[PDB]
C-alpha cells in the first residue's frame, strides 16, 4: 500500500508537467491534470501518514523480542554448566560404599583379635 | 530508519517552489524514501501478532524463572 501511494505522486507530477509544457497535449487529458487527483494525493498522504506510526511501534515491539531471547539464552547458557557439574557431582561421591563398609568394618571388628592372630605365625616368609 | 521518514515526508511537503531551471529534488525524494519503506523493521508482519509472541515467550521466561524458584 505504501509503495503504491508513491508511484501515484510521481505519475501525477509527471503528467502535470507535460500539459503545462506541451501545448499539443490538450487532447490527451489524463490523471495529474484536474483538481480531483490533487485531492487523491492528500488522502494518500493521510493514509501514508498513518502506516508509518503503526510501523514505528512494530520496530520497538521487535526490539523487545531480542532482549527476551537474550534472557532465554542466559537462562539456558548456565544449563550447559549445570549439566557439566551434575556428572562431576556423581563422580565425586563414592557410590556403593556398602562393599567397603562390610569389608573394612569386618576387618576392624576385632582389632584386638587380629593382632593376637598375627603374633603366633610370625616370620611366616622365607 | 523510521523516525527519518517522518522527517523526509516533512521535507518533501515543503518543496517544488516554482518553474524554471530547477533541481529534480522531488524525484530523488520519493526514491530515497521509497527505499526507507522497503527497509522498515516490522511491516512484514502485523503488530498484534508480534505483541502476542512477546507474551508467549515471556510465559516461558516467567515459567522458567518461576520453576527456577522451586529450584531453590
Amino acid at each position: 500500500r505504501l509503495l503504491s501511494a508513491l508511484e501515484d505522486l510521481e505519475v501525477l507530477s509527471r503528467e502535470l508537467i507535460e500539459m503545462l509544457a506541451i501545448s499539443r497535449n490538450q487532447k490527451l487529458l489524463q490523471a495529474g491534470e484536474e483538481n480531483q487527483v490533487l485531492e487523491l494525493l492528500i488522502h494518500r498522504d493521510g493514509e501514508f501518514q498513518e502506516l508509518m506510526k503503526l510501523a514505528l511501534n512494530q520496530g520497538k515491539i521487535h526490539h523487545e523480542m531480542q532482549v527476551l531471547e537474550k534472557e532465554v539464552e542466559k537462562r539456558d547458557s548456565d544449563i550447559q554448566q549445570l549439566q557439566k557439574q551434575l556428572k562431576e557431582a556423581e563422580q565425586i561421591l563414592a557410590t556403593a560404599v556398602y562393599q567397603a563398609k562390610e569389608k573394612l568394618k569386618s576387618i576392624e571388628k576385632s582389632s584386638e583379635e587380629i593382632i593376637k592372630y598375627a603374633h603366633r605365625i610370625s616370620a611366616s616368609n622365607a | 530508519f523510521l523516525p527519518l521518514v517522518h522527517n523526509i515526508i516533512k521535507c518533501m511537503d515543503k518543496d517544488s517552489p516554482e518553474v524554471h531551471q530547477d533541481l529534480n529534488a522531488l524525484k530523488s525524494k520519493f526514491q530515497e524514501m521509497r527505499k526507507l519503506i522497503s527497509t522498515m523493521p516490522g511491516i512484514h508482519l502485523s503488530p498484534e501478532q508480534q505483541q502476542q509472541q512477546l507474551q508467549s515467550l515471556r510465559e516461558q521466561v516467567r515459567t522458567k524463572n518461576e520453576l527456577l524458584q522451586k529450584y531453590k
Partner: peptide, 12 residues
C-alpha cells in the same frame, strides 16, 4: 555443596 548453593543462588 557451598559452591552449588552459591551456584543455585547466583547466575554462574
Amino acid at each position: 555443596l557451598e559452591r552449588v548453593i552459591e551456584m543455585i543462588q547466583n547466575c554462574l
